[model samples]
Target chain A: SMLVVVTENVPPRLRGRLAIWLLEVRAGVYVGDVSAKIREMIWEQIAGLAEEGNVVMAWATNTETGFEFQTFGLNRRTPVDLDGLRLVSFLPVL
Target chain B: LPLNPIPLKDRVSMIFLQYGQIDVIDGAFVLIDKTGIRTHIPVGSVACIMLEPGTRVSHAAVRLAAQVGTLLVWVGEAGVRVYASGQPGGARSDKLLYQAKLALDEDLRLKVVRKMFELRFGEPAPARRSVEQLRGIEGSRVRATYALLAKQYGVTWNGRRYDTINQCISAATSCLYGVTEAAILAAGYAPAIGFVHTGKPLSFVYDIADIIKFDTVVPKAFEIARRNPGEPDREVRLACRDIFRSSKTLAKLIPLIEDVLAAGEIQPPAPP
Candidate 1:
């Protein structure tokens, strides 16, 4: 259990910014060990920078899925906790 | 795939939260800071949590830790003294029995020892050698390696003295042993049962930790002495934390423990 990946629909400049703390595996995909502290700072960055864009951060953790994830926008793939397992909840098209 | 460690190296941003209150904010273990920050820590990803003097735990939080199979360790400040820890990983009994079996049989013990040497040195021990002879070599090799680190880091090697570098190493190793013990005891094995190292409460802990020592904590301990000279324990503790995190020590240790303990045939990890 040692990984955190932040994916956002933010710009290229903001995409590469997370490189200071984690490796950018792909476009908008930032990953690293978000030891209890950086998760907040990273969340702050995503909230401040990904103003109009959607963001989803997934992390390896202790659970049935062996990982957990969070989101930062109105997206169809929302996270729902069923019992103790993490499952995706899709919003109905209105 | 009972306890396959999650490799969390690719994505890496880190920060530490200490001196906090722990409770279940929802379904997760949340640590609340003095400033009222709620941080949900992934339970399994954490190797072991040592509750220090300033930290307090709730019954629900302890249950959460137990529920997640993560050890809730209580220790002195700087983790120098361990008051108690949650039950270790893997209580299937086969692994412990396997370890005991290996310790009992001389031939099997030699093979495990060789594997440890190979894990450390990238090769097997000289062929046709007895365990005693190999023990002789292991001792000598340590001295040589320590001497090398001594010269490189400018920290004088004192052949296991009780202060400075020794304290740094000891503290770091204790941390290593804490993690190792959690894995051992959580997995249902005896801490006193060791193959190469026997007798000490931490004999097996030393045995497992030593295989990866030079590459991890040992170097960090020396770095602590050289880089953070002002306070040895504080520096070493923090430094060792970095090493343990980056090295994916917990990720590698279970299989490493299982692999090295394979005195003969590889056993299947019991499905929890």
Candidate 2:
């Protein structure tokens, strides 16, 4: 299962794509359970369907960190993995 | 009166006997209503009888129902509760009685509760959480879910208070009530022994009902409440019935009960 957060003005089609495998918990948030393969497929959809939106997804996994996350687009905040630890890093202002 | 000689299969899950007098005369069961209309039901085909308010039955009728193995459940207008009832002949009482014994043992109760929790949430309960804590979590989660769906659909949900005056909520629940009771009976499981919900006879009914309740029934209830634009009683009933038929809910129920019971094979309610 994973929680995927989308932002940056998500369009209808992108929302539809996100909805195929996830439930929209909020305006830009979706959550669902899927196989690792399906999650990868969902990740591809998010990237393929992104016009100006950004996607942040995290899944439960059997790792030292216990969870893994992905980020896309020009978001001010990005994920930084320092060794096995998941971290959040800020992007420079334009 | 004659018991169905053949086993029951392939019919609506329940036939409601309400606002009438049921009697056996001339070796046949006859239902006489306020309208003075007499209707004869084909007992062999019915899985169970839901006796709602204002329903009366004669001794001979009971004898025949017992002989036929038709379970009689006295329920509220919408099965909001089972006011009273008797186990149909051939009920696999052993399985449910066996479940009650499981409940008395804390180890077994927790074990079953964990299994139920996993089935409901699709995940194991957090490693350190106690059963009480698990119950609290489940309760809060269910309450939050109603609000979320209410917001999603733009409906005014004051809370899930089931009064007949509230059309949308009542309509939504009534169908679930009907379907769940029918499922519980068809499986030959007792409605009295519950795991999560207690202090009432409907505990086990609610326990087993919750496994698929939200996924199957609640969403449809919300849809009916918001977008359907139909009268509450009939529309909701029809919607649930349609879903019940297409989903093969009746067929799945017995196996679902069987899985819950630690005991071996359960005998489903059959005609005859």
Candidate 3:
């Protein structure tokens, strides 16, 4: 259930929302060990209100790499699936 | 923002700290050593923090922990005595009312007591026994268990002479009690409302911890005792930590509490 959320230029309200559910270990970085339902609910909050801000959430799961992640908004790096494995791909600068 | 406390099962069970000053350093909860080095404490994700002797807490640290719903317990050396503790939750009137209702009614209390007895002994209690009689039975069984465990560990038992084994057992059980009390609070139940053990501030904590004691921490204490470490208390605490982790004791505690209390055959009061 360990989860981490990294945010860039997110609204202060979004950061506050994350603080309610997780520890802010670094600026714009939140960490928590929450139930799946809670994690989903937090992500729902981010999904609804992130606006132009970017966010990435990673959480522990039963898998080959032992973790999975989701992202919201625009970012230079996007998640890619390579043969059913999750990997990151860097986009060219616009 | 809603202050929803983290579920106990998802939190780190407990940690014991000694000889440090706990403070909020740059908005992060930390313990500062005498040399001014800081050890960050993941207070938001931990259920209980047991402060042993020589540990001091700054006001800001206490405030942060309270906001995060982590229980801060001030205990004597080796965690033998719980001096004071900051309340995490236990503010739910419905749960408290239900707990008190069960304790005040003898029939209900007896049912709950019987459940605990059955769970601890793995057998139904002898029928028609009063709570007093059952308590005596449990006491005898507890004494025998201690003797048996001591003999199995090949440690000399001097019958609670503040001996190494006794100290180790006390320390280990205190650690269990800290986590037990945290779970009790997180569940929003009154720790003083008890069935088997009563008349103390932590009566309910004692009751719950006792049920878990023999299976989890007591054996570890004896195992530490046989090793004859200079810091038996510390060794016992470390052993109990590993035991709690491996057994997922923290995750099981709250549900077990509900199961035990449900023996009274009463519905929990609905929230407003």
Candidate 4:
């Protein structure tokens, strides 16, 4: 499946880990087509080590939306369920 | 976490590196230059890395390559000579047994050899021909094709003499051999076991690569050689990379190996 991961303020270690399995297209954006098992392993590393860091991963899946995404750390954009369809909504900035 | 080897079709075919040191720097595989600048390599996603002259490899790099199931091949200048290669853990016992059984049985070996000939020539191999006779016929055709390609490119035809054109072909074919060996190993078969070619470390690699060579690399080599480039071998290497990618050669190789072996009439051993 196609997977995309965007990172912010993460340790370089995490960034390096992502680079092993994905192509770092930009400074912190990674893209790759990997297996479900590999996707989970990368996600686990991000969740464990991404202290003070933020990430959003979206991947292709067989769903009504045709894709799914997950976020880590406290990002302003949160996933919301609108009629069981996943959407991203922004938080109000001060 | 230990992971399954990535399927062959999804991986980059191969890369050639020289005059740089390959090391795992900062948890990423990279080639370090003389000035210590790091050029990262996606070691996990590539099928083979051909380490040419002037390239140094660190232990860390090798370990990471093994973990990722990527082959590391050491070669001479322009990848003309293969000195060594690393295995990425794809030799399953069952597949080795199956390959050996096919090679040992004369009738079945003939079937596999004929299949290879048919694939290469796009015609049925001569009927009632023994392997030795078929090999003789194929050699004649191979030489004829070389001469024909030389004429097409206006390269002076010499009987396999060492020349810029021959060097180009050698370089291109060496790259093909690396990729073919990687595929054979990753498909869980032994590269030494052979039906058509025999008694060498890469006999089967030669067998499979012969089927693919004339189609992709050989003609490209002649084309590049015709230009009279200063570095004919280097030009040949670039051309081969383009050929492999555009044709999706890596994607087809593993399946082709399986299909060719199936002609032996013996089923591949069931996975344990």
- The interface RMSD values of the models, given in order, are 12.3, 35.6, 17.2, 18.6
Candidate 3 per-residue lDDT, tens place, B1-272, comes to 78666877677667777677988867778777687656666688778888878888899998888877788888886676656556644677778888888999999999999999999999999999999999999999998999999899998987754468888888888888888888888788988888988898889999998997899689888888889988777677767777887798988898888888989999976644
Selected candidate, larger lDDT, 1 vs 3: 3
Model 2: residue B101 alpha-carbon error in angstroms: 3.0
Q: How many backbone clashes are present in model 4?
A: 0
Expressed as tens digits, the lDDT of each residue in B1-272 for candidate 1 is: 35443332321112223578877765657666677655556665565676677887888888766655566767774465455555444456676677788888888888888888888788788999887887888989988988898898998777875357777888887778777776666556777788778777678888888888888788778877777477676677666666776687766776787788775564645645
Fraction of real interface contacts that model 2 preserves: 0.00
Candidate 4, residues B1-272: lDDT per residue as tens digits?
A: 75776876677677777678988866778777787656666687778888878888899998888777788888886576566556634467778888888899899999999999999999998899999999999999999999999899898878675377878888889989888988888788888888888998889999999998899788998888888888776677767766887799989898899989999988876754
lDDT of 1 at A18: 71
Query: Which candidate number maximizes TM-score?
Result: 4
Candidate no. 2 TM-score: 0.61
Q: Relative to the unseen true structure, what is the C-alpha lDDT of residue B155 in candidate 1, on a scale of 0 to 100?
A: 88
Off by over 4 Å in 4: A1-94, B88-90
Can you tell me which runs of candidate 3 are displaced by over 4 Å?
A1-94, B160-162, B270-272
Q: In model 2, which regions exceed 4 Å deviation?
A: A1-94, B1-9, B77-79, B88-97, B162-167, B177-188, B227-231, B263-272
Clashes of each: 16, 5, 0, 0
Look at candidate 3 and tell me the lDDT of residue B180. Answer: 89
DockQ of each: 0.05, 0.01, 0.03, 0.03
* TM of each candidate vs. truth: 0.62, 0.61, 0.73, 0.74
How large a fraction of the reference contact set does each model reproduce? 0.00, 0.00, 0.00, 0.00
User: In angstroms, how far off is B214's CA in candidate 3?
Assistant: 0.7
